[PDB]
Design a protein around this nucleic acid. Sequence first.
RNA 1: GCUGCAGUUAAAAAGCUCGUAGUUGGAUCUUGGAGGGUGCGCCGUCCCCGCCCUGCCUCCGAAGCGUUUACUUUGAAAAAAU
Lengths: 129, 84, 190, 158, 150
Amino acid sequence: VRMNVLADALKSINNAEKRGKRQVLIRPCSKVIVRFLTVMMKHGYIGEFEIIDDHRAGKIVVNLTGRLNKCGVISPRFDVQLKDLEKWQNNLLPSRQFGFIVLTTSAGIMDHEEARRKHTGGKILGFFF
Amino acid sequence: MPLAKDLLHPSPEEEKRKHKKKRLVQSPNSYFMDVKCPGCYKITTVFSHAQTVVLCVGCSTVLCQPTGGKARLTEGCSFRRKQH
Amino acid sequence: SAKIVKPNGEKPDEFESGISQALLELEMNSDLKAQLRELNITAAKEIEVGGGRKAIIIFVPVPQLKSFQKIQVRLVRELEKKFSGKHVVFIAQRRILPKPTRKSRTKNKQKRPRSRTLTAVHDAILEDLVFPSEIVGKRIRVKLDGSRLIKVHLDKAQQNNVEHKVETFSGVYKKLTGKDVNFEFPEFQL
Amino acid sequence: MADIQTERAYQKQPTIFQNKKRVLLGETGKEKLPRYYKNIGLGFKTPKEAIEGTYIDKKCPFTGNVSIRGRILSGVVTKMKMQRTIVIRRDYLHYIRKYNRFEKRHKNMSVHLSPCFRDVQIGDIVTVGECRPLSKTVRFNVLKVTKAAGTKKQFQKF
Amino acid sequence: GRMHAPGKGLSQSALPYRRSVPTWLKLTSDDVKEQIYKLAKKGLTPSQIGVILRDSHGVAQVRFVTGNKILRILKSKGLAPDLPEDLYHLIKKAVAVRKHLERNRKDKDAKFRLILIESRIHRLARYYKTKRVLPPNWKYESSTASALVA
RNA sequence: GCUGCAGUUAAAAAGCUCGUAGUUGGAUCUUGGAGGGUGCGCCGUCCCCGCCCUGCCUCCGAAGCGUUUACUUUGAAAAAAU
């Protein structure tokens, strides 16, 4: 069955972009999916998206450009300690310079750069570049 | 799958061909009707697929028998849908 | 006067007074009285539409609404005609309760009802703003600029009562929530 | 109630004396037993039962000679087999880096339970406080019964 | 998909959006609640009441014409019976299989199947019990089950 | 071989399923304008912050005082040698 819903949305995306696709319909969506789709959006890795309202759990249409090499999800959502964030981005990001680790902290779902600036930390959601 | 559809606005025709659960936003593919039988003049509302015998208001009549799917309406009968 | 029907914890006035009087004007009549009489209103608020025809929003107790729904179209027709130059409609005051924190404190206040959530309430507002149509579906669009727009699908039949309104519903909605709303038409399953 | 006094020794609170005496009504006097109590501190309300009660329990934190100092813990009641004592199960998380997931682990803790508390029933979450060695096993004493009919799986009433 | 087989089959209602309606539906809460209570008097199950209501008389969902699910209506009238219906028909089914197996000790398929049914029951009861509906300590026993379902 | 292994044929998926512990669990309840750090020759560039385009009650402090946690964050407490 389902343990997580994010992992499906992310994968669906990745296969869309790999095909050469410019849109996807993910299902079923969640506040966390929105928040993650949103961080991606702010940065350029996707275009605009749209939450369609079935009387159920939702369905999202993402319009994607093609700046996206990969958006992954980290499971389980490990706790990170401010100097485990430095260790994570190195593990899974292309160059020190770019790509984001996106985690969930007490003060919001955020990319790790925003994390560093706020100076808060938490549990790791996923990534992209 | 040629990198071309508007997943958000898909066509009504190919939306209408797809499984009820596969529809963009879901919805059913079943309906209701009003049914006649001259002898009476009033009209019983009936569900397109039905399982139950449906009998009319008074006359022990009939008014379809069930099946795998849509109820088979019985011989000399008439039916407007229908609403919204 | 002001005392009866503009109440709900504040007397007040002006517009509330005018509209109330209008209701009385309607009250003289037949079946176009007695049916209304029971109905009562908490307050009226006025907010405009961009070129400048204003919309008038009326507030209802919520147990009342079924009856208001009962008339609505006929009444709105009268209020638009007598009070012309305004878009009239009907919204029910709904309570909304804050999500508890934590240290909000929390003396575990009695649960609360989904039928009290801010989102549910807003949904109710959308439902209330349009009337006999029905909201067929909804979508949310994330704009490049961190913005969000809600596309609210509408039925088809009998819509006309609302067609001219649409812009006000958008503006009215904004005044309440601060979110942006847009409207559309469908399709007919085949 | 049940006659306390039950044993062979006369149960009494130390240095809380009597003296009944002559004349009429009461008779002697009506309460017939002066009772001494104290609040544990840490804001633990001394339940009415303690003040209202006849029971003796030296071990009681409110009525008895024991002080509560040290760790204040909470746990779930696993057993109430023994008279005036209970066993609580304490769940805790063990962290294992060497690769990192820690695994639930638990410990049972024997703790004295004053007759002032009742309905001490297994399943109840309870707040116990550290104390002087009461018995070879027991380090703690039940200070507060957290409760709840909740955990619904049944419907509690009042 | 599926619990005690390899079946995949997606199959469902597909419930309607439209928030309100039917609109061509007049009647009233009054009407169908009476209807429901009278049918439940006759011994009918909520599944059964929902079906017969659906097809014979206009009720798309009883929920919509009345803010309450059929079972809740029954329980509030005072028509709820001792164990939930799904659990009933499971217990009844394991009974009929058990009676057939006592007759035909040579049928290994049946013995397998009885197990499956029984496991489904025990888990369901575990769920109902967790949720107060059944008294904690509720159990289904062959011995007593026969006597229970009727 | 956590990070970071392999198991159709190379060494390796139990004949199959039920199933307790254990692990694992759907959606859904709040919405430019200047302050301070270091570069470049009075000007600005680039973070960070309260904002625009949310602890209740008791009745400022105090107190009541926490729904439980885990988490994470900021402090103290943290032997020297190393």
